[PDB]
Every structure is written in structure tokens, then in C-alpha cells.
Amino acid sequence: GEIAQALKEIAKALKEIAYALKEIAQALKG
Amino acid sequence: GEIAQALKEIAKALKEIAYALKEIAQALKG
Amino acid sequence: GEIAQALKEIAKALKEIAYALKEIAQALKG
Amino acid sequence: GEIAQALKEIAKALKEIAYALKEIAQALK
Amino acid sequence: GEIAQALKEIAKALKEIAYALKEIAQALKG
Amino acid sequence: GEIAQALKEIAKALKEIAYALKEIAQALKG
Numbered sequence A, B, C, E, F: 001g002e003i004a005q006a007l008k009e010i011a012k013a014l015k016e017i018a019y020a021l022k023e024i025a026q027a028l029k030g
Numbered sequence D: 001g002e003i004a005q006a007l008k009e010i011a012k013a014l015k016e017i018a019y020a021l022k023e024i025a026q027a028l029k
């Protein structure tokens, strides 16, 4: 249903954010 | 089903965010 | 059940996020 | 309905966010 | 009504995260 | 009700992340 779909799309967004922040972690460590 | 999967993907995403943010804490503190 | 477990993992994840962000706040302000 | 509207706004938001994060990936890599 | 509000707040939060990470990307490039 | 609460707590967490990351942006612009 609609809630299932909403949350699947949110899951995807947060997984890309995980990735972005892991790249930032590395960049700042030097 | 679909709800179980949605929430399991949110669990995974949020656990990677916990990790990423702790690596940021470390980077910024030295 | 799968939903019960999913929600327990969300609870846990958000407690680690709360903490991580406290550490970030502190790094930057002090 | 309220959920119908929420999801219409969410689709748009997430398409912009997808792109933003693609630009971030590229900047760093 | 509670779920409608939850989802609206997620949408907004993720747009602010997108922005913050664009600013971080730029800082580290420059 | 448990899902509604989970997502309300996610909204809160992600709003605090927005804050943290905007403070990082500023710190690194230095």
C-alpha cells in the first residue's frame, strides 16, 4: 500500500545519505 | 511482507547513520 | 514477530544517533 | 486525502534529493 | 493524522539534509 | 501506533542531523 511505498522510498534516501556521510568521514580523516 | 521489509531497510539505514556520525565525531576531535 | 523486531532495532538505532549528535555538538561548540 | 498529498510531496522531494546526493558523490570522488 | 504528519516532517528533514551535505561537499572541494 | 511513534522519533532525529551538519558546514568554511 501507500505507507509501504512511502517507507521504501525513504529507506533508499537514507541509504544514499549513509554513503555520503561515509565519504565525508574519509575526506576529513585526511 | 512489504511492511516488514520497509522497516528492516530503515533499521539498516539508521545503523549506518549511527556509524557514519561516530566516524565524524572522531574525525573532528582528531 | 518481524514488525516487533524491526521497531526494536529502530529504537536502538535512534538512541545511538542521539548520542553521536551530542558528541558532534560538543566537538564544535567546545 | 492527507496520505495521498504526503506521498505526492515526498516523490518530488526525493527526486531532488537523489540528484543532490549524486552531485555530492561526484564532488568527493 | 499522526502518519500524515510524520511523513511531512520526514520529507522536510531530508530536504535540509540534502542542503547541509551540498554545503559540506563544497567546503571540502574548496 | 508503534509505527506512528517510530516515524515521529525519526523526524526528530533527522531534524537534529540537519542542525549538526549545518554547524559542520560553518566550522569547515572557517
Ligand SMILES: [N+]
Binding pocket: A003, E003, F003, F004
Ligand atoms: N502504519
